[PDB]
Amino acid sequence: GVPTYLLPGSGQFLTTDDHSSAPVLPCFNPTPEMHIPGQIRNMLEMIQVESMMEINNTDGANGMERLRVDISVQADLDQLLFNIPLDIQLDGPLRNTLVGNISRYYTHWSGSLEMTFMFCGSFMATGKLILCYTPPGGSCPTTRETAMLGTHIVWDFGLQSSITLIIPWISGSHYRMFNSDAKSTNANVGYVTCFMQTNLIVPSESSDTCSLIGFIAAKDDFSLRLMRDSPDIGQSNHLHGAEAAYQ
Amino acid sequence: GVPTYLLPGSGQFLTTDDHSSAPVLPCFNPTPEMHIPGQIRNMLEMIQVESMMEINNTDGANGMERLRVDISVQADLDQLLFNIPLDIQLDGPLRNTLVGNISRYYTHWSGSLEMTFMFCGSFMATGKLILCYTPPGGSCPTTRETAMLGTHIVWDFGLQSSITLIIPWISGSHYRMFNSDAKSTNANVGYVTCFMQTNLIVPSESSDTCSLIGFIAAKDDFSLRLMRDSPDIGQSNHLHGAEAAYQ
Amino acid sequence: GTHIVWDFGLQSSITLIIPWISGSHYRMFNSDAKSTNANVGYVTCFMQT
Amino acid sequence: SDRVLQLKLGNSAIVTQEAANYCCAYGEWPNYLPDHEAVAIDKPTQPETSTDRFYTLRSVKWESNSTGWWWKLPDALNNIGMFGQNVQYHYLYRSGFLIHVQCNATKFHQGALLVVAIPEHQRGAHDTTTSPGFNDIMKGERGGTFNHPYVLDDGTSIACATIFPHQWINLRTNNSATIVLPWMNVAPMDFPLRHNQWTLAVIPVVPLGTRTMSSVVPITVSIAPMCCEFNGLRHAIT
Amino acid sequence: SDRVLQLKLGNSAIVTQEAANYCCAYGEWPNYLPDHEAVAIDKPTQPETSTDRFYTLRSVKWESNSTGWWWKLPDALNNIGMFGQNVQYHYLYRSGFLIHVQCNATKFHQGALLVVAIPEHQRGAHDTTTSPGFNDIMKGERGGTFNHPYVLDDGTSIACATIFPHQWINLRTNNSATIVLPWMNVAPMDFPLRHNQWTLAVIPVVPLGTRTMSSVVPITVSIAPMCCEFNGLRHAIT
Amino acid sequence: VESIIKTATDTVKSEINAELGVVPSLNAVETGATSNTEPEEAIQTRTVINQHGVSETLVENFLGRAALVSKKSFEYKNHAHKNFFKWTINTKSFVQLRRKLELFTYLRFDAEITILTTVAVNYMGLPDLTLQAMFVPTGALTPKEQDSFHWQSGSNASVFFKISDPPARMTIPFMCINSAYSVFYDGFAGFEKNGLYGITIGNLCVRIVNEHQPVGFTVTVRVYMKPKHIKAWAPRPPRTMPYMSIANANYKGRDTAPNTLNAIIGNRASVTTMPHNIVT
Amino acid sequence: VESIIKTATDTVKSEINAELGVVPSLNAVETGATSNTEPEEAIQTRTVINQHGVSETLVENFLGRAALVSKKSFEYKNHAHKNFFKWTINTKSFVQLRRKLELFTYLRFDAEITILTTVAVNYMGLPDLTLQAMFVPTGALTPKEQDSFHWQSGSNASVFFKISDPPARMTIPFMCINSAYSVFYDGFAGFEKNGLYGITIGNLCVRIVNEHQPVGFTVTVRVYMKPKHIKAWAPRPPRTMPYMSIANANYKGRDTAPNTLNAIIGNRASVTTMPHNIVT
Amino acid sequence: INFYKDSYAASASKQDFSQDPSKFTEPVVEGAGAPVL
Amino acid sequence: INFYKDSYAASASKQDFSQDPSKFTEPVVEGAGAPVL
Ligand SMILES: Cc1cc(CCCOc2c(C)cc(-c3noc(C(F)(F)F)n3)cc2C)on1
Ligand SMILES: Cc1cc(CCCOc2c(C)cc(-c3noc(C(F)(F)F)n3)cc2C)on1
């Protein structure tokens, strides 16, 4: 016979191993493949679709009220409207999104993100906003004069209902990490803030309070590494009927 | 030597595995092969032979009386003569047939079935019947007006003694399943009913009650998958002599 | 039946074609409105929204 | 020029002067079942124009406190016109769908509806271990409404519903949404009375609002089956 | 033209004007033992015409309550004519069989007989653990009858007996059945006195009936060995 | 006639038919032939390219499964079955395997044998005993004691295995004196009339080679057989009545349907009664 | 449209832009299309040859991990679950696997099954027991007792393994009657209205083949599943509300955020409050 | 393949796809839709 | 590669690098920086 010797690791069961194994049903003929719409081959395809950010995650906002940011006709100038924590690891407006949910099944990420805001006020409503992305380093800016110094886009409400703010991949390291420490230099992405560029102006018969819906997605330069179990799902007891499966 | 490592599954005994094994009697010379009539290579060959359906599975019908359906000269029109439950998994007229018995050794099936009825009345006896196959969805039809709307064949008694009702494979899924739930959408095949198209007419010296024998078989477009133990045979104790084999 | 859903907008007008759907080559102007060789059918208008 | 659109099927046609282009679910387009994908061997019936046409369901009223509406296909149409007849007389069916949701208001109105076609939208019941019943699921032409649109009544989230074929009706932008759905199933055909391939959901993510004259703002759904095929003819399961 | 048939072997011939084509067991046809399949080295005797001919056994009466009849081959013929003589004088034999079961009645009679040739029909006893005895099995020319035809007296079923070479005699259709049986065994030859290759079973699945003049309706069996060969000559085991 | 079939046959589209003298749906059961009516001739069909495989029904696979053929438990202790047993080999003791084999008249195949052993105390731990399974062919002498000379197995084939090792396994070649095994035998075993009707491989002798321990254990040996390189002839009507003996096909039937000598299929109210009728 | 992507797309240097009629950063969400604004069009970029691989997000790998699908512990002793259990197979009992599978509408894959066994005394040592896992497909008879005939497994597939051997393992082919498994089913199981809404593979029956010992033990069997040769269709919104039943998608939500039916994301003081703001 | 010297020790033979149903379904001597009689 | 006779027993298939995001990101019929309306 062939002389052999067993190596460490012999007999172990690694959940991520990759080997062939005995076919339970020999000569089994699987059902012929048929074409089905929507085949996905790489999870990156899925995270490239924009989904809604729960920007209004505040007490008093229930259900879908949390998905829209309401802005109203201001009395003062250069007003700050809202900011968005860019925490994907720590619970935040970006966590329950396609890109957020899937990324949380990994530990490392790299690539540009994109935020798209759709103005849902009346047609007679006008305004200009400024969306700013601030690379990490300091405190989140609270004035337009400061925010304006980062990556930004000035948005003019009009026929095209939506604007896009690219959050370009600006990092020292090839990848960032989903650290449980939000202030870590390998995790913090910076901030996104939104100010009135001018103001929201509407006529008497239009609602003087309008909503914005923010979406986010990954671009095709995105990459995810080191798979892990998502912190978004857990179990304390048996699910109903789980035990009755043995009866 | 060669460095190796054992994988999970090592040392197990899978009843369906397929490997070579040590020959007990080395240099043994098996008896030369001889030609023998009736070689069968695929079980599908066997189920293509029609066998008798126990259509008259009722109390009062003993033995072979259960294999023939008696029809008599009617007094009313469009009379329902009998129906056939198409249960192959649940005990029914089709269970103890070649196609039925062998199919029950599997879990999935696909293909057209065929039912052939042979009229065994006297030569002087005439009549026309209508055999209907009703795809699933509702209740088994009880009137010819309704049954007539499905797949059917109008049979005229004559020199050719037998008629064939094709139960074409009409399913959404590639295969059907032998579910213990007869009303399952992946199991129910529909119904077969038989009505008088006209009537059974015979002269004074002929028996006014005649029998039909129904047969069923699979066509060559049939396919069976996922082998399992047949529910048709069991054991509670040792068979007589089984223990004496150790004495 | 045969229909068209009309959305009010820059184009002010909509057109409903009443296609020639008859058994006979021609219809007739019978003094009997319910005659099978005269009745053309109906045109009705509902709010879509 | 992608704000204007006309759809014509059979004896029906629809135009819109404020569209937002239109969606082709998963970039596909309806088509008849090819021989190399077929299973049922009986020759099918392809009604064409008598079934492949627009059917308009009863409208719903968009209110300030509305939670959203849904219609399951083909259930919503299983009892309408010749489509419904074929469905009742055949064991198997197959078809794509051209969906056109319409809703207009005023340039003084605001509101945004997410119009999404959800494949296999299996509903869940709220705060109970008992699975939804037949009447909870089969609403027919009337359709149903969402109890908790926030999680699409299935424990997930409307936020990520955009992963499904969809469009929006944002009052200041457009007044209609159009989605072309191809056959979506793991089988080439199916039994129309006990399984719904798609679910049309229209949810007001941004509530209807205005300060002008108040008036009833309806939402109307028109659906046109496409490339219909039917197999397994028998009596009607009315 | 397949309702008419004449069989001719040796000095015997049979015709039928109401046949139903005829069966060739497993699509085979009798033939002599080829050199490359032979085992016994002594030169065999091939009697031909003196053994390969039709032998008609005593008839049986088909009654209203009959359960069926059976004849085992070669036992049924082991004591008839030159075939029987060769069988008694030789240790080994080999042959095919041409079976012709005949039964006629009136166009006012009804009844259906399953005529099946069962290979290795090993009988079973009813409600006892004791195996069938010699006299239960070896009936000779007279043959035996079924106790429980429903299960072919072996715990299986007559319903599936059609898996074996067979034909039917349905009174309104035909009056005879013909089955050609090739040599059926795991050995090129065998000892004729202790093993039966085939069993001819004639079972009335549909009882004999009529309302006309009652008369005795017989069933007759004629069997013709084919391509007979005998080896191992010695004295006769009468 | 003969041909290679790898998938279910396709279906061709068929048109309307109204031909005189052509009646495909009519047949004659009396001929002994099965109806040859094609679906295309009974109804209007569409074209279907059928890709369903037919591998799982290959005889090689249908019978190609390891099945229990023998199970014996005995006491391993000081007997002052004495620490070993002798089994007269047969394939008629367990119904699952038996019924499948009996679906054929003749079978030619090599047999893969697998031996599984388990032990239980009559608790201080389970001993990893060594066993010896010896194949004693017809006519050879069978062991008289746990340690008789027979076990030196000079010519018989023996396999020694430990309880801690994977089940023992070897292949028994097709060993009939004929071209195939007779699953059924309509004949007698001897030249005299008192012989046995119906239905010899030999004896499988298994012993524990270890001397007895201070305490007793129950040892159970399960033998499995898997036929391979299979050739089968003349399919048969499946068994319906429960089995009674390993020596014959005697039958009695269940006390109540199904499978009672009186009725194989359970009863339904009448021939017009649909058992699991859909009540919509 | 379709193409082979092995690495993240590169970035091209972009210049200053001031073109009339060209507004790449403006989009229309109503179309249902995701913003197609490229980084190069939103800001001035440099050239970057991106070599980041995209292998780990391949569906084959994302789902290609062995996950616990079943866990059952029972008492192995003299029962005078009787030394064996029957599990109606399902993939909805453990949330980690369930949630990932539910990220798709349809899935086609072969399943690698691994069975891990452990035992504990109820101390004199741990017995190296032999177990038998038998796959009883839909419609087949399930074992009634630790030693009923069903276990002779003449056709069912069974695997015998010892506790001292590496976990047992075999591959279950993609076995749906359709081209793919329906992770979600918006329909009913039967033709009647009383049927079950939503959501049959069969039963996995596991027993200890050894007879009982003089003392009792607790035996736990863990079954893991790893899909391979995967094809997936129609991605879905991830589950957020805790699961309630294996039979449905019923929801209730946590008592307090996060993941309460009322608010999926935990609250922050206001929309202008930065939660982990850097206080330099 | 097979490392044992005896060929009967080899693994299963699952490649015999030939078949002739007719020997069981049409064992009649005289072979469309014409009357079988 | 694979020593079992059934191909479904083989190890994982990690080489399908093709993809078409557009079926999810741009399912619109009418395909730069020009107004999408
Ligand atoms: C009829 C019929 C006859 C057969 C042959 C069955 C052969 O199986 C036996 C044989 C011959 C040997 C062993 C056997 N067990 O162990 C050994 C060893 F010791 F030689 F390895 N041989 C076990 C069985 C069941 O199959 N059908
Ligand atoms: C929906 C859906 C359905 C599936 C199929 C899961 C199949 O897994 C089962 C099966 C069929 C067999 C075993 C199994 N365990 O042991 C055996 C053996 F005995 F056959 F080896 N089979 C275990 C599970 C969980 O995946 N998603």
PDB file of N, CA and C in Angstrom, chain B residues 145-167:
ATOM      1  N   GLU B 145     -71.862  16.357 -17.999  1.00  0.00           N
ATOM      2  CA  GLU B 145     -71.744  17.709 -18.548  1.00  0.00           C
ATOM      3  C   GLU B 145     -70.466  18.373 -18.058  1.00  0.00           C
ATOM      4  N   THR B 146     -70.109  18.079 -16.815  1.00  0.00           N
ATOM      5  CA  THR B 146     -68.919  18.647 -16.209  1.00  0.00           C
ATOM      6  C   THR B 146     -67.667  17.855 -16.565  1.00  0.00           C
ATOM      7  N   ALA B 147     -67.720  16.540 -16.381  1.00  0.00           N
ATOM      8  CA  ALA B 147     -66.581  15.673 -16.675  1.00  0.00           C
ATOM      9  C   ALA B 147     -66.119  15.835 -18.118  1.00  0.00           C
ATOM     10  N   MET B 148     -67.097  15.887 -19.009  1.00  0.00           N
ATOM     11  CA  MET B 148     -66.890  16.026 -20.442  1.00  0.00           C
ATOM     12  C   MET B 148     -65.956  17.187 -20.830  1.00  0.00           C
ATOM     13  N   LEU B 149     -65.797  18.159 -19.933  1.00  0.00           N
ATOM     14  CA  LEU B 149     -64.958  19.329 -20.195  1.00  0.00           C
ATOM     15  C   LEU B 149     -63.463  19.087 -20.044  1.00  0.00           C
ATOM     16  N   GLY B 150     -63.092  17.938 -19.493  1.00  0.00           N
ATOM     17  CA  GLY B 150     -61.682  17.632 -19.324  1.00  0.00           C
ATOM     18  C   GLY B 150     -61.153  16.767 -20.456  1.00  0.00           C
ATOM     19  N   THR B 151     -59.979  16.180 -20.245  1.00  0.00           N
ATOM     20  CA  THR B 151     -59.368  15.304 -21.232  1.00  0.00           C
ATOM     21  C   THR B 151     -60.224  14.051 -21.251  1.00  0.00           C
ATOM     22  N   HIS B 152     -60.637  13.613 -22.432  1.00  0.00           N
ATOM     23  CA  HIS B 152     -61.463  12.418 -22.493  1.00  0.00           C
ATOM     24  C   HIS B 152     -61.416  11.649 -23.798  1.00  0.00           C
ATOM     25  N   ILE B 153     -62.028  10.474 -23.758  1.00  0.00           N
ATOM     26  CA  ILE B 153     -62.118   9.594 -24.908  1.00  0.00           C
ATOM     27  C   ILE B 153     -63.508   8.963 -24.867  1.00  0.00           C
ATOM     28  N   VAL B 154     -64.190   8.946 -26.009  1.00  0.00           N
ATOM     29  CA  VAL B 154     -65.505   8.322 -26.086  1.00  0.00           C
ATOM     30  C   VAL B 154     -65.219   6.947 -26.647  1.00  0.00           C
ATOM     31  N   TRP B 155     -65.646   5.938 -25.905  1.00  0.00           N
ATOM     32  CA  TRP B 155     -65.417   4.541 -26.242  1.00  0.00           C
ATOM     33  C   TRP B 155     -66.644   3.814 -26.775  1.00  0.00           C
ATOM     34  N   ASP B 156     -66.490   3.228 -27.956  1.00  0.00           N
ATOM     35  CA  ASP B 156     -67.557   2.477 -28.609  1.00  0.00           C
ATOM     36  C   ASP B 156     -67.204   0.989 -28.562  1.00  0.00           C
ATOM     37  N   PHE B 157     -67.988   0.203 -27.835  1.00  0.00           N
ATOM     38  CA  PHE B 157     -67.722  -1.231 -27.740  1.00  0.00           C
ATOM     39  C   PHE B 157     -67.775  -1.859 -29.125  1.00  0.00           C
ATOM     40  N   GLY B 158     -66.791  -2.692 -29.451  1.00  0.00           N
ATOM     41  CA  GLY B 158     -66.775  -3.333 -30.754  1.00  0.00           C
ATOM     42  C   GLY B 158     -65.718  -4.413 -30.868  1.00  0.00           C
ATOM     43  N   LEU B 159     -65.304  -4.726 -32.094  1.00  0.00           N
ATOM     44  CA  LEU B 159     -64.290  -5.751 -32.306  1.00  0.00           C
ATOM     45  C   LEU B 159     -63.034  -5.472 -31.488  1.00  0.00           C
ATOM     46  N   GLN B 160     -62.555  -4.231 -31.505  1.00  0.00           N
ATOM     47  CA  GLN B 160     -61.398  -3.872 -30.691  1.00  0.00           C
ATOM     48  C   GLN B 160     -62.025  -3.787 -29.305  1.00  0.00           C
ATOM     49  N   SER B 161     -61.632  -4.701 -28.432  1.00  0.00           N
ATOM     50  CA  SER B 161     -62.187  -4.786 -27.086  1.00  0.00           C
ATOM     51  C   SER B 161     -61.781  -3.717 -26.082  1.00  0.00           C
ATOM     52  N   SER B 162     -60.647  -3.070 -26.317  1.00  0.00           N
ATOM     53  CA  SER B 162     -60.146  -2.124 -25.343  1.00  0.00           C
ATOM     54  C   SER B 162     -59.931  -0.700 -25.803  1.00  0.00           C
ATOM     55  N   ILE B 163     -60.104   0.236 -24.875  1.00  0.00           N
ATOM     56  CA  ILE B 163     -59.909   1.649 -25.167  1.00  0.00           C
ATOM     57  C   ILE B 163     -58.826   2.194 -24.241  1.00  0.00           C
ATOM     58  N   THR B 164     -58.120   3.216 -24.698  1.00  0.00           N
ATOM     59  CA  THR B 164     -57.079   3.812 -23.880  1.00  0.00           C
ATOM     60  C   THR B 164     -57.303   5.289 -23.606  1.00  0.00           C
ATOM     61  N   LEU B 165     -57.213   5.640 -22.328  1.00  0.00           N
ATOM     62  CA  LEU B 165     -57.341   7.017 -21.884  1.00  0.00           C
ATOM     63  C   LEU B 165     -55.941   7.460 -21.482  1.00  0.00           C
ATOM     64  N   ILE B 166     -55.375   8.411 -22.210  1.00  0.00           N
ATOM     65  CA  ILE B 166     -54.060   8.898 -21.855  1.00  0.00           C
ATOM     66  C   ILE B 166     -54.227   9.945 -20.772  1.00  0.00           C
ATOM     67  N   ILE B 167     -53.458   9.819 -19.699  1.00  0.00           N
ATOM     68  CA  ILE B 167     -53.497  10.818 -18.644  1.00  0.00           C
ATOM     69  C   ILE B 167     -52.189  11.537 -18.900  1.00  0.00           C
TER      70      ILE B 167
END
